[PDB]
């Protein structure tokens, strides 16, 4: 029934198992060091996280 059909399909791996922690998007996701931020999320939050553009 509904209980065993609403989200039956597993989501343990693949693009659909992850998302940016700000916009919840599955595209262009950085997973290095557990950032879990999209490539657009990170460009905005980098200064706060502590990533600087040295060279």
């Amino acid at each position: 029934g509904f209980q065993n059909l609403w989200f039956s399909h597993p989501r343990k791996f693949g693009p659909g198992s992850r998302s940016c922690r700000v916009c919840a998007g599955h595209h262009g996701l950085i997973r290095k060091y557990g950032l879990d931020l999209c490539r657009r999320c990170f460009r905005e939050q980098a200064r706060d996280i502590g990533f600087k553009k040295l060279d």
């Binding site: 060091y33 557990g34 939050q45 996280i49 990533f51």
Partner: protein, 211 residues
């Protein structure tokens, strides 16, 4: 817990970023300016630098208590392990974020864009900034969008000294016609005491000791 130092630093950065985002969304009317996170192993103190500590704290420190409890619950801290202090920003005119929020307030109120940005420019310049640049872009007049720029004083754009001397802020305003973007840039003054601006002079400014 046992975690690599790289992951510890990354987690600290992520926590600081999320806290800053949440606080700027919550205490915007409170004249929020910034947040500093001191995450010592024993307790995590969080300094909320704002212009109105009275409003930030609220009645008998109830809003601050709510915020600390909420932060603890959100980030899975222990009761009393995370704690917030409020703090009053010395010079509100030299803080880009506060000026951006004030311009936001004026525009939502309905003040003419030219009048509002000129008032903000005058206040910032009187506050002691070397230079100021305010840009307001969007559907200001008519269907076609335009950008209005107001510049006073001297302002630098390129090089490392930008990171030390320039303070920027960006905000958005939702009016009937659409979204209007506000950008504020302030060039802080050379403050040897290190209170109103960077302690070190500009790299190309050679100062002579009078004989």
């Amino acid at each position: 817990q046992n975690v690599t130092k790289k992951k510890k630093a990354v987690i600290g950065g992520i926590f600081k970023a999320e806290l800053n985002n949440f606080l700027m969304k919550e205490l915007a009317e409170d004249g929020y300016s910034g947040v500093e996170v001191r995450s010592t192993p024993a307790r995590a103190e969080v300094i909320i630098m704002a212009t109105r500590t009275q409003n930030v704290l609220g009645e008998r420190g109830r809003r601050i208590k709510e915020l600390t409890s909420v932060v603890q619950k959100r980030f899975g801290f222990e009761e009393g392990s995370v704690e917030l202090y409020a703090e009053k920003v010395s010079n509100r005119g030299l803080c880009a974020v506060a000026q951006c929020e004030s311009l936001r307030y004026k525009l939502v109120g309905g003040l003419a864009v030219r009048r509002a940005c000129y008032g903000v420019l005058r206040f910032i310049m009187e506050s002691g900034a070397q230079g100021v640049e305010v840009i307001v872009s969007g559907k200001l007049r008519g269907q076609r969008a335009k950008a209005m720029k107001f510049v006073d004083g001297l302002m630098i754009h390129s090089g490392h000294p930008v990171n030390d001397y320039i303070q920027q802020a960006v905000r958005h305003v939702q009016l009937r016609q659409g979204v209007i973007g506000i950008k504020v840039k302030i060039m802080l003054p050379y403050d040897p005491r290190g209170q109103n601006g960077p302690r070190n002079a500009l790299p190309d400014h050679v100062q002579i000791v009078e004989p």
